[PDB]
Structure formats: C-alpha cells, structure tokens
PDB file of C-alpha atoms and ligand atoms in Angstrom:
ATOM      1  CA  UNK A   1       0.047   0.336  -0.185  1.00 31.93           C
ATOM      2  CA  UNK A   2       2.218   2.787   1.247  1.00 30.18           C
ATOM      3  CA  UNK A   3       5.098  -0.222   0.307  1.00 33.69           C
ATOM      4  CA  UNK A   4       5.542   2.194  -2.747  1.00 33.84           C
ATOM      5  CA  UNK A   5       7.609   4.351  -0.988  1.00 34.93           C
ATOM      6  CA  UNK A   6       9.263   1.961   0.236  1.00 30.25           C
ATOM      7  CA  UNK A   7      10.344   0.253  -3.977  1.00 29.00           C
ATOM      8  CA  UNK A   8      10.647   4.677  -4.352  1.00 30.93           C
ATOM      9  CA  UNK A   9      13.717   4.756  -1.313  1.00 28.23           C
ATOM     10  CA  UNK A  10      15.208   2.052  -2.327  1.00 27.78           C
ATOM     11  CA  UNK A  11      15.880   2.521  -5.747  1.00 29.07           C
ATOM     12  CA  UNK A  12      17.005   6.563  -4.924  1.00 27.54           C
ATOM     13  CA  UNK A  13      19.290   4.847  -2.409  1.00 28.52           C
ATOM     14  CA  UNK A  14      20.784   2.701  -5.178  1.00 29.00           C
ATOM     15  CA  UNK A  15      20.114   5.831  -8.046  1.00 31.62           C
ATOM     16  CA  UNK A  16      22.529   7.381  -5.056  1.00 31.38           C
ATOM     17  CA  UNK A  17      25.178   4.244  -4.721  1.00 33.43           C
ATOM     18  CA  UNK A  18      25.748   4.653  -8.429  1.00 34.09           C
ATOM     19  CA  UNK A  19      26.663   8.363  -8.952  1.00 32.96           C
ATOM     20  CA  UNK A  20      28.296   7.627  -5.310  1.00 33.10           C
ATOM     21  CA  UNK A  21      30.427   5.311  -7.705  1.00 31.79           C
ATOM     22  CA  UNK A  22      30.342   7.430 -10.384  1.00 28.98           C
ATOM     23  CA  UNK A  23      31.747   9.789  -8.701  1.00 27.89           C
ATOM     24  CA  UNK A  24      34.387   7.265  -7.098  1.00 29.19           C
ATOM     25  CA  UNK A  25      35.581   6.912 -10.589  1.00 23.70           C
ATOM     26  CA  UNK A  26      36.221   9.345 -11.228  1.00 20.39           C
ATOM     27  CA  UNK A  27      38.230  10.931  -8.265  1.00 18.98           C
ATOM     28  CA  UNK A  28      40.242   7.407  -8.496  1.00 17.87           C
ATOM     29  CA  UNK A  29      41.602   7.713 -12.093  1.00 17.68           C
ATOM     30  CA  UNK A  30      42.522  11.513 -10.478  1.00 22.86           C
ATOM     31  CA  UNK A  31      44.717  10.142  -7.972  1.00 23.37           C
ATOM     32  CA  UNK A  32      45.782   7.124  -9.206  1.00 20.56           C
ATOM     33  CA  UNK A  33      47.430   9.985 -11.776  1.00 19.81           C
ATOM     34  CA  UNK A  34      48.276  12.146  -9.495  1.00 22.43           C
ATOM     35  CA  UNK A  35      50.606   9.421  -7.356  1.00 22.11           C
ATOM     36  CA  UNK A  36      52.702   8.120 -11.104  1.00 25.20           C
ATOM     37  CA  UNK A  37      53.404  11.879 -11.481  1.00 24.78           C
ATOM     38  CA  UNK A  38      54.835  12.364  -7.832  1.00 20.60           C
ATOM     39  CA  UNK A  39      56.587   9.240  -8.278  1.00 19.89           C
ATOM     40  CA  UNK A  40      57.870  10.105 -12.240  1.00 23.62           C
ATOM     41  CA  UNK A  41      58.964  13.761 -10.703  1.00 25.18           C
ATOM     42  CA  UNK A  42      60.983  11.639  -7.374  1.00 25.33           C
ATOM     43  CA  UNK A  43      62.461  10.572 -10.185  1.00 24.62           C
ATOM     44  CA  UNK A  44      63.236  13.458 -11.830  1.00 26.54           C
ATOM     45  CA  UNK A  45      64.256  15.215  -9.085  1.00 24.90           C
ATOM     46  CA  UNK A  46      66.609  12.214  -8.301  1.00 24.84           C
ATOM     47  CA  UNK A  47      67.666  12.179 -11.623  1.00 25.61           C
ATOM     48  CA  UNK A  48      68.728  15.936 -11.728  1.00 23.21           C
ATOM     49  CA  UNK A  49      70.632  15.823  -8.495  1.00 23.64           C
ATOM     50  CA  UNK A  50      72.749  13.236 -10.310  1.00 25.57           C
ATOM     51  CA  UNK A  51      73.355  14.068 -13.387  1.00 25.17           C
ATOM     52  CA  UNK A  52      74.193  18.047 -11.129  1.00 24.59           C
ATOM     53  CA  UNK A  53      76.638  15.889  -9.041  1.00 24.34           C
ATOM     54  CA  UNK A  54      78.754  14.361 -12.529  1.00 26.06           C
ATOM     55  CA  UNK A  55      78.906  17.485 -14.278  1.00 27.09           C
ATOM     56  CA  UNK A  56      80.243  19.305 -11.241  1.00 25.90           C
ATOM     57  CA  UNK A  57      83.496  16.458 -10.475  1.00 24.38           C
ATOM     58  CA  UNK A  58      83.542  16.402 -14.627  1.00 22.27           C
ATOM     59  CA  UNK A  59      83.786  20.990 -14.627  1.00 20.64           C
ATOM     60  CA  UNK A  60      86.786  19.598 -11.247  1.00 21.34           C
ATOM     61  CA  UNK A  61      88.592  17.311 -13.506  1.00 23.23           C
ATOM     62  CA  UNK A  62      88.846  20.278 -16.455  1.00 23.40           C
ATOM     63  CA  UNK A  63      90.123  22.772 -14.436  1.00 25.08           C
ATOM     64  CA  UNK A  64      92.300  20.122 -12.402  1.00 23.46           C
TER      65      UNK A  64
ATOM     66  CA  UNK B   1      -1.411  22.348   8.395  1.00 24.23           C
ATOM     67  CA  UNK B   2       0.947  20.778  10.470  1.00 24.66           C
ATOM     68  CA  UNK B   3       1.467  18.355   7.863  1.00 27.52           C
ATOM     69  CA  UNK B   4       2.145  20.790   5.362  1.00 26.11           C
ATOM     70  CA  UNK B   5       4.787  22.323   7.450  1.00 23.11           C
ATOM     71  CA  UNK B   6       6.522  18.735   8.692  1.00 21.32           C
ATOM     72  CA  UNK B   7       7.122  17.555   4.625  1.00 17.43           C
ATOM     73  CA  UNK B   8       7.749  20.421   2.924  1.00 17.16           C
ATOM     74  CA  UNK B   9      10.830  21.810   5.639  1.00 14.62           C
ATOM     75  CA  UNK B  10      11.729  17.712   5.790  1.00 13.20           C
ATOM     76  CA  UNK B  11      12.088  18.601   1.798  1.00 14.27           C
ATOM     77  CA  UNK B  12      14.521  21.452   2.041  1.00 13.11           C
ATOM     78  CA  UNK B  13      17.090  20.310   4.961  1.00 12.28           C
ATOM     79  CA  UNK B  14      17.225  16.774   3.160  1.00  8.72           C
ATOM     80  CA  UNK B  15      18.799  19.756  -0.810  1.00  7.32           C
ATOM     81  CA  UNK B  16      20.004  22.045   1.588  1.00  7.66           C
ATOM     82  CA  UNK B  17      22.084  18.558   3.107  1.00  7.33           C
ATOM     83  CA  UNK B  18      22.428  17.162  -1.219  1.00  4.92           C
ATOM     84  CA  UNK B  19      24.131  20.934  -2.342  1.00  2.00           C
ATOM     85  CA  UNK B  20      26.445  21.302   0.059  1.00  6.15           C
ATOM     86  CA  UNK B  21      27.155  17.844  -0.564  1.00  4.60           C
ATOM     87  CA  UNK B  22      27.993  18.417  -3.340  1.00  4.54           C
ATOM     88  CA  UNK B  23      29.869  22.090  -2.836  1.00  2.00           C
ATOM     89  CA  UNK B  24      32.036  19.372  -1.247  1.00  2.52           C
ATOM     90  CA  UNK B  25      32.511  16.871  -3.698  1.00  2.95           C
ATOM     91  CA  UNK B  26      32.790  19.395  -6.608  1.00  6.44           C
ATOM     92  CA  UNK B  27      36.088  21.514  -4.721  1.00 10.01           C
ATOM     93  CA  UNK B  28      37.663  17.774  -4.012  1.00 10.95           C
ATOM     94  CA  UNK B  29      38.171  16.880  -7.857  1.00 11.04           C
ATOM     95  CA  UNK B  30      39.462  20.633  -8.931  1.00 13.25           C
ATOM     96  CA  UNK B  31      41.551  20.360  -6.389  1.00 15.78           C
ATOM     97  CA  UNK B  32      43.025  17.027  -8.021  1.00 15.90           C
ATOM     98  CA  UNK B  33      42.673  18.402 -11.357  1.00 17.25           C
ATOM     99  CA  UNK B  34      44.345  21.153 -10.096  1.00 15.21           C
ATOM    100  CA  UNK B  35      47.327  19.447  -8.667  1.00 14.76           C
ATOM    101  CA  UNK B  36      47.525  16.913 -11.885  1.00 16.94           C
ATOM    102  CA  UNK B  37      48.302  19.768 -13.752  1.00 13.52           C
ATOM    103  CA  UNK B  38      50.596  22.173 -11.133  1.00 16.67           C
ATOM    104  CA  UNK B  39      52.205  18.364 -10.813  1.00 19.44           C
ATOM    105  CA  UNK B  40      52.812  18.091 -15.085  1.00 19.97           C
ATOM    106  CA  UNK B  41      53.552  21.884 -15.528  1.00 19.63           C
ATOM    107  CA  UNK B  42      56.892  21.427 -12.599  1.00 20.73           C
ATOM    108  CA  UNK B  43      57.831  17.953 -14.725  1.00 20.86           C
ATOM    109  CA  UNK B  44      57.246  19.555 -17.994  1.00 20.78           C
ATOM    110  CA  UNK B  45      59.732  21.863 -16.366  1.00 20.75           C
ATOM    111  CA  UNK B  46      62.625  18.507 -14.599  1.00 18.25           C
ATOM    112  CA  UNK B  47      62.731  16.426 -17.910  1.00 14.34           C
ATOM    113  CA  UNK B  48      63.848  19.644 -19.432  1.00 15.57           C
ATOM    114  CA  UNK B  49      66.764  20.630 -16.903  1.00 16.78           C
ATOM    115  CA  UNK B  50      67.326  16.326 -16.472  1.00 14.53           C
ATOM    116  CA  UNK B  51      67.197  16.524 -20.369  1.00 10.82           C
ATOM    117  CA  UNK B  52      69.920  19.533 -20.654  1.00 10.14           C
ATOM    118  CA  UNK B  53      72.065  17.625 -17.609  1.00 11.99           C
ATOM    119  CA  UNK B  54      72.846  14.132 -19.981  1.00 14.20           C
ATOM    120  CA  UNK B  55      73.642  16.427 -22.634  1.00 13.05           C
ATOM    121  CA  UNK B  56      75.869  19.258 -20.622  1.00 16.02           C
ATOM    122  CA  UNK B  57      77.174  15.803 -19.030  1.00 18.76           C
ATOM    123  CA  UNK B  58      77.698  13.970 -22.477  1.00 17.46           C
ATOM    124  CA  UNK B  59      79.657  17.669 -23.436  1.00 15.57           C
ATOM    125  CA  UNK B  60      81.919  17.431 -20.343  1.00 17.40           C
ATOM    126  CA  UNK B  61      83.097  13.788 -21.269  1.00 13.51           C
ATOM    127  CA  UNK B  62      84.191  14.401 -24.501  1.00 11.63           C
ATOM    128  CA  UNK B  63      86.331  17.364 -23.471  1.00 10.64           C
ATOM    129  CA  UNK B  64      87.386  15.086 -20.644  1.00  9.77           C
ATOM    130  CA  UNK B  65      88.627  12.444 -23.158  1.00  7.01           C
ATOM    131  CA  UNK B  66      89.905  15.366 -25.622  1.00  9.47           C
ATOM    132  CA  UNK B  67      93.125  14.835 -23.547  1.00  8.93           C
ATOM    133  CA  UNK B  68      93.659  11.501 -22.763  1.00  8.63           C
TER     134      UNK B  68
HETATM  135 CL1   CL C 101      29.933  10.624  -2.949  1.00  8.17          CL
HETATM  136 CL1   CL C 102      35.522   7.435  -0.863  1.00 10.14          CL
HETATM  137 CL1   CL C 103      75.767  10.688 -14.459  1.00 11.72          CL
HETATM  138 NA1   NA C 104      56.044  23.843 -17.332  1.00 16.24          NA
END
C-alpha cells in the first residue's frame, strides 16, 4: 500500500550509490594519475641531482 | 497545515544537505584536477632540466677524452 514509498526509497538509494561510484571512478583515476606523477617527479629530482653531481665532478677534472 | 509544513521542511533540509555535499565533492575534484595540472607542469620543467644536463655532461665527457 505504502510499500510504493519503500520501493522508491530503495531505488533512490541505488541511484545515489551509482552516482557515488561514478564520482569515485573520477576521483580514483585522478588520484592514481597524481600518485604516478609524484613518483615520476621524485625520479626526475633524483636524476637531476645525480647529473649535477657528475657535471661538477667533470668541471673539476677539466679545471684540474 | 502542520503536515504540509513538516513535509516541506524535511525536503528542504534534505536539499541543503545535498547541495552542501555536492559543493564538497566538486571542490575535492577540482583540487585533484589542479594538482594533476601542477605536477605535469613541474615535471615538464624537471624533464627539460634533466635532458639539458644529460647533454651537458656528455659534452664535458668528450672534453675530458680530448686530453687523454
Ligand atoms: Cl560521493
Ligand atoms: Cl571514498
Ligand atoms: Cl651520470
Ligand atoms: Na612547464
């Protein structure tokens, strides 16, 4: 009788859950890209440090 | 009508709660989008610096070789 309201609330809760799963898809993708970019940034910082050390080494050799 | 009042107040409270939650969600998404953009730009700068350095080191190594 009023179980119309029951089906409607179950459906509302399912629609909400699908929308939250779409939101999570988006934020999870963005978060994973961010994680990847942070790792690649760290790698680039480390590489630059090593390359700059080698550059100063070689400059020292060449001034003697 | 107390009934009409009760029903409309309940729906409106629920709509505030909804819209404030939506504001929070979109703000979080926007911060993540901005952070991705920032990191791509930072890593572009770093990658150009690193490739410059690799080229410079390689030139210095050739100069060293020029004397052995
Ligand atoms: Cl959500
Ligand atoms: Cl979550
Ligand atoms: Cl090196
Ligand atoms: Na840049």
